Amino acid sequence: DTLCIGYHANNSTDTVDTVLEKNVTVTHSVNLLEDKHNGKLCKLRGVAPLHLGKCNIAGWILGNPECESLSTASSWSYIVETPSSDNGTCYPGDFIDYEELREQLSSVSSFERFEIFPKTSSWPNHDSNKGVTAACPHAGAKSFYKNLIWLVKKGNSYPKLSKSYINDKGKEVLVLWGIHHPSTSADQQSLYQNADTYVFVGSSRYSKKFKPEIAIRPKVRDQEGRMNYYWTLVEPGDKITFEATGNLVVPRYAFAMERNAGSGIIISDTPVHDCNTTCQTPKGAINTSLPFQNIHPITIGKCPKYVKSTKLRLATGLRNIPS
Amino acid sequence: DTLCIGYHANNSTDTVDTVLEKNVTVTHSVNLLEDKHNGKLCKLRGVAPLHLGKCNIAGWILGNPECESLSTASSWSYIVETPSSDNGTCYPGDFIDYEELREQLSSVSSFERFEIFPKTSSWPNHDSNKGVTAACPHAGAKSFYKNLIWLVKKGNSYPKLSKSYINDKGKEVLVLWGIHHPSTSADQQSLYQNADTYVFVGSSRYSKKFKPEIAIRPKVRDQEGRMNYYWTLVEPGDKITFEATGNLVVPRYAFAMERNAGSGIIISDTPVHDCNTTCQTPKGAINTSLPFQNIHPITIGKCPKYVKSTKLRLATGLRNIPS
Amino acid sequence: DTLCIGYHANNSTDTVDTVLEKNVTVTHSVNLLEDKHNGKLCKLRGVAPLHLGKCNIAGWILGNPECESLSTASSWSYIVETPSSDNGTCYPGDFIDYEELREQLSSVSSFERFEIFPKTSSWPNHDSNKGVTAACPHAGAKSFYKNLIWLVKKGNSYPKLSKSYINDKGKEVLVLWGIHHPSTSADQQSLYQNADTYVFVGSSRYSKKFKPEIAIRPKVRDQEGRMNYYWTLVEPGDKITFEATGNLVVPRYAFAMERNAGSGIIISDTPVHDCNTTCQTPKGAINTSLPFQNIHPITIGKCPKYVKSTKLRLATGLRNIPS
Amino acid sequence: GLFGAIAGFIEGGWTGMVDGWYGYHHQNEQGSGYAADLKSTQNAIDEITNKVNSVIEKMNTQFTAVGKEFNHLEKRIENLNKKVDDGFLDIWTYNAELLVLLENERTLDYHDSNVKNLYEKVRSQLKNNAKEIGNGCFEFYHKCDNTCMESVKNGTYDYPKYSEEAKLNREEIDS
Amino acid sequence: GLFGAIAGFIEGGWTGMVDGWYGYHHQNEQGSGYAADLKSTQNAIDEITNKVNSVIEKMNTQFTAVGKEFNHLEKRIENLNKKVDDGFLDIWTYNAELLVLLENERTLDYHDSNVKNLYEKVRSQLKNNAKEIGNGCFEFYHKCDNTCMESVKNGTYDYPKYSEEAKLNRE
Amino acid sequence: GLFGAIAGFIEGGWTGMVDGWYGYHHQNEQGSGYAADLKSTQNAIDEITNKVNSVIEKMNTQFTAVGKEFNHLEKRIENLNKKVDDGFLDIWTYNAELLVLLENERTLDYHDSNVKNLYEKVRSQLKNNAKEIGNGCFEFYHKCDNTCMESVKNGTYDYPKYSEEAKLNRE
Ligand SMILES: *[C@@H]1O[C@H](CO)[C@@H](O[C@@H]2O[C@H](CO)[C@@H](O[C@@H]3O[C@H](CO)[C@@H](O)[C@H](O)[C@@H]3O)[C@H](O)[C@H]2NC(C)=O)[C@H](O)[C@H]1NC(C)=O
Ligand SMILES: *[C@@H]1O[C@H](CO)[C@@H](O[C@@H]2O[C@H](CO)[C@@H](O)[C@H](O)[C@H]2NC(C)=O)[C@H](O)[C@H]1NC(C)=O
Ligand SMILES: *[C@@H]1O[C@H](CO)[C@@H](O[C@@H]2O[C@H](CO)[C@@H](O)[C@H](O)[C@H]2NC(C)=O)[C@H](O)[C@H]1NC(C)=O
Ligand SMILES: *[C@@H]1O[C@H](CO)[C@@H](O)[C@H](O)[C@H]1NC(C)=O
Predict the structure, then answer these.
(1) Do A140 and A280 sit in the same domain of this protein?
(2) Whether residues C70 and C191 fall in one domain
(3) For residue A60, which ligand has an atom nearest its CA?
(4) C contact chains, 3+ CB pairs < 8 A
(5) Among C204, D1, E163, F147, which one has the highest count of C-beta atoms within 10 angstroms of its own C-beta?
(6) Radius of gyration of chain C from its Cα atoms, rounded to whole angstroms
(7) How many domains does chain B have?
(8) Binding residue per annotation — B28?
(9) Residues of the domain holding A32
């Protein structure tokens, strides 16, 4: 009669690497490396991304005539741009502190577009109907941004402009405006009449007097003139004043919003889907059951640590010796 | 007759966690995570911090009427500013490279206030007695910052000013000055007479012409005007030169100083004491020894690493099995 | 008859430390810490660094008379600049976005100087010959930057200049220019006649109007006036235009480049040699053979990780018991 | 390896014992067959699950954006950010890889001790009553029925009970 | 757990052994009680203290400020700074947490190995002279007084002296 | 050590055994000397060489410049750059330092393991045909010639060949 002590062997073909040997066959093992992604840009913690289609942050926020703008969402976990997203600032110029603005707008918890300075009532002594450009074509016609108003002289007269907005919204108001820098003395005259002009904009925190720099720049989108883009966040009870004698691309629409802690912008051709995730990758969402992932180094969420590993197999069983 | 082999068992209740078993009662153990602090703000590098009370760095450097200074050391290891510190730039405007100055003033091994431009001698053609405001009150009276003189016209004349300081101190001199931006043409005329004015500040390293922006900004402390704040460190043997036809808020007091290694600003309500420590936390000081800590991420000194662990215990003794 | 199973001992003196005890003599052990270097500056990715000699990047890129010059197509893996490199901006002033330029030039895939605005034909209405200074001497005479022309009035006349350049190259072109700020109104007339001047510079991405700041700065290198240095990278399709009524320090030489995958600048007196490395340190080059290194924390290449340790030798053999 | 049992004195595995990691094979008048040692198998699953969780549990992590956008005149901060990204990458890749190699060795070394302690536990019970025939086997100097066999497997072997029969058989073999 | 001695063949610990970490328990003719094994307990203490000082003393670190201050238009550098802070936190937490787990398991195994080695040493000196009765105990076939007992512990036990004295005690 | 062999029952090492880490000291009727256990030595060499290569080769790292230049008005960024370098310096130094300490200890135990294992392998072959005399020594009850000696080494030892011959000498 015999009693033999032994150990389990099986059908297992999986291998782990040890400090002493590389290909050791194990009876049981666990993978610690998340190597798979769902190929979709999901809602991050039940909140869907703000998918900007063919538009970029500048395009969407300025209300580029090629961008929807009247179909956003009161909240977004992150923003999505596509690598081809061309529609932005159609009138050439610099969009000052742009990446900073993109950063601030990456995540939002309350967001309402409202007419800060409504078109039909705000500008009784200035022309608010002209001030469309070949720089911004839309549906065959000379167009302009939806969120701004390019004020121009009211037939030979551009009187002094002075208009303010308080803030009865109980959150910060994002106000964007533009400074027009004409090409020539003739272009200044044709738009504003007044030759030596200035724009002043101020809040309790913001203060800048702008002076248009008339000069022919190399033609960009039929323009030798330039338009610089500006923005400020006006605190829950602060006032913003707009003073000008010419060259003011005036705010028409502004945004009441609550900035959400901290997100990002995914630039990707990855389609958006009605799925939830704890971790988002620019190329698909990932499970967070595992400590590591090799999908993408740039993730948004409560995410596993990116590693350049191809395999992280941790043995559970023993050496499989079916001999 | 018998001789046995065996191990120690005791009164110990302490548990450790192993890779294979969660709650293990061990005979002996050492703690690797520091969770205790003294609740006091201590002397780092044998030097006490610079506690600012109700004042913030802006208010303290500029002679804000509520800040006193001088008798508040010549050397400090770090700056203590309280979270409620309101008293800063009483007259509204922008403090240029403010956080940069904050970092630079954080630790100083020599600090000496000196009248760069004696009030008495320096200004024979401008008024140095009028330059007070309702924005900066002291004991219920129009006052101003101690370290600055707000020059104003002398009986309907602001001759061009030109003043230089050549650094004869053995160290760097921190010079602070201001550009006043009036709200109206009249305010500009009542203060400076001149109307089309400028401010020029020159050094070997520094050069900037300032052109006042005259506009009605929203009222901040009854001020529709703004006062931008500027600073620069004048290297030993270097000349600093001021030139103006108005809007210059001259330096009166400059600071010869020696910037120390690498410290910061602790913003805390926690009290400052006569305790000597090697590691400081906003919450209190840690008397190190251990490699880990869960007190605070933000710390100054030769500190333990901040970990999110609530318990880190090394078993030294064996598994306690009393019976 | 006897058979004893035993282990090895030898003449080995290699001592290692283990968790359980310090200084244990082992029969065999390997070092894991790179403690040695070649004391030479080597090629990286088979490419030699650009050594700046007695110059720094500013002196090099502008045409500082004391600087080398690369009239031909080149490429570097990194930039070497000696701690004693004095030859920079010979005429005093600010080099706008200087550290940004330094980084962008740190490693270049292709670099080629060309005469953007040829000296002989570009300025028939302004003086290209005059525009030499005592501040920039060369072989004991008034000279200037090689890559720039200090244009000046042609016999009591300075007409408006308009000069543009279309990037016919198929790679970015780095353009540099200067804005001269004279000390007196006499200086502004003596050099430019015009008195109320501007300088306008534009591309598809760039646009700036410059206005001379006339004032007496403290005398640096015999100069009371200042020169500011600006640069831009013109894209392939792009055109860069210059407009001025005075004060423009015109480009003469510009540089076509392909910016290489980001590198760095070594400030070292270590001599450059025809050696190759994967890792470069200011002190000389190291072998990326071992995982850790205690040579220098600032390295360029695929390097071992910097470490404070003086020894990291891993036991391989057994305890050495001579007996 | 480390404890000499797995791939040491016990040459190979058993594809016949499908109910556990460690156990026994028997032969008697009644029959043969494999059985798993429950006490050791369970404790080991328990502990290995603990180790598996520990490597995964202790991670936790923050809600982070990772990406940061910088302009054409912000290369230095843009490179600084890549340094942070790359440095963490090198830390996490090296540690993950080393942790796994070292812990896989420690796991197999653990299965070796479990099998070695199992051999030793039985050797301690049977003493003089069985012959250690190698390969982790015992050849009983007495008649060991399914019951007796179960007593050993359950750790309640009665040595004085089988002593006389084992002493006579051993003394005859040794004769 | 690992060496199958502590909570293995030696089921439990002795509260009666205040003396040190690993020792003996004699029961002869002249009084019974416990006494630690010094030439192992001191070694263990020295080695374990070394293990502790290593985990502690290998840290060191430099003087740093950590906290950074940034304006309203410096959110990206504010956020980059938080990434560094969180990245280091996650690194250190996970490392500290795992080393603590891994190492606690290593220390306990060391104690198990030390007890196993102490039991094995005695069994080797004794041999036929004393019967292995499980749970770390040896039942002497011969008579072993308080001096004889001290010797087995000392590593000095003459097998021939009690050879025949114990041989004629196997029945 | 951990397994009781190296600096335990096998008191010290042999300088006369240059051929390998582990082995035997044969001493019979036809000359004597030292010989390495080919299998156990070679196996150990291979495994150790892998352990070494794992520590060095899992490193890799990509192209980095490290060095960063800032102006006088960029001290906070200068300091953020320093916090990153020192952070990584604190991590690598402590980790490398601990990885060497912890791993040197696991290596010496591994050697102790191969010696203990080899000891028991021979013991298991000879069962009662040889006496255990300490220092990891077996004294043969029979006449183990060079071919008999070269059977215990390669693990082909024939217990029935000497069984009864050894049985007689024992008495
Ligand atoms: C919104 O998105 C599209 C895509 O970028 C913009 O359209 C593109 O605009 C460029 C620049 O004006 C066009 O170039 C032109 O090509 C024509 C041929 O018709 C040529 O003869 C012209 O002289 C000129 O160089 C390009 O054709 C066009 N590309 C696409 C894909 O549509 C569009 O302008 C944007 N609109 C707004 C309002 O932002
Ligand atoms: C989106 O992400 C995950 C998907 O599983 C969810 O996270 C869990 O949240 C629940 C309660 O909401 C917790 O008790 C779990 O422990 C979480 N686990 C993990 C792995 O994150 C989250 O709830 C999801 N949101 C929605 C709207 O379903
Ligand atoms: C110093 O800070 C105090 C903080 O409150 C300021 O006082 C507040 O400011 C306005 C104008 O004085 C008052 O109407 C509030 O009620 C104030 N509170 C108190 C308690 O006085 C004060 O303005 C600051 N002084 C300076 C010189 O900066
Ligand atoms: C070059 O450097 C030396 C050392 O500072 C100096 O004497 C010389 O005048 C410099 N010349 C130029 C043109 O930079």
Answers:
(1) no
(2) yes
(3) 1
(4) A, B, D, E, F
(5) D1
(6) 29
(7) 2
(8) yes
(9) 1-41+274-323
